[PDB]
């Protein structure tokens, strides 16, 4: 119990302190390949639809 306590709490705390403040105050740092968005979705942030695809036929 004490092993899982120290090794999933203390390096997690040290790294997650390290990655917020120092790391994301350096500007060009951790960067993510963007989530793909699909024509039936709606954007969670602002809120607007994405137009669906047209008719299917000749399959």
Ligand X SMILES: CCCCCCCCCCCCCCCCCC(=O)OC[C@H](COP(=O)([O-])OCC(O)COP(=O)([O-])OC[C@@H](COC(=O)CCCCCCCCCCCCCCCCC)OC(=O)CCCCCCCCCCCCCCCCC)OC(=O)CCCCCCCCCCCCCCCCC
**Which residues contact another protein (rule: CB under 8 A)?**
3-4, 7-9, 11-13, 15-17, 19-23, 25-45, 50-51, 53-56, 58-59
CA distance 56 to 59: 8
Question: Locate tokens 């695809």: which residue?
Answer: 53
Q: Which does 49 bind (CB under 5 to 8 A by kind): ligand X, another protein, none?
A: none
CA distance 59 to 46: 36
CA distance 10 to 3: 11
Q: Which does 11 bind (CB under 5 to 8 A by kind): ligand X, another protein, none?
A: another protein
Q: Which residue is nearest to ligand X (CB)?
A: 17
């Amino acid at each position: 119990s004490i092993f899982a306590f120290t090794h999933v709490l203390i390096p997690v705390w040290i790294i997650h302190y390290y990655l917020k403040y120092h790391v994301t105050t350096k500007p060009y740092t951790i960067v993510e390949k963007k989530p793909r968005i699909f024509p039936g979705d709606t954007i969670l942030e602002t809120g607007e639809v994405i137009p669906p695809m047209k008719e299917f036929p000749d399959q």
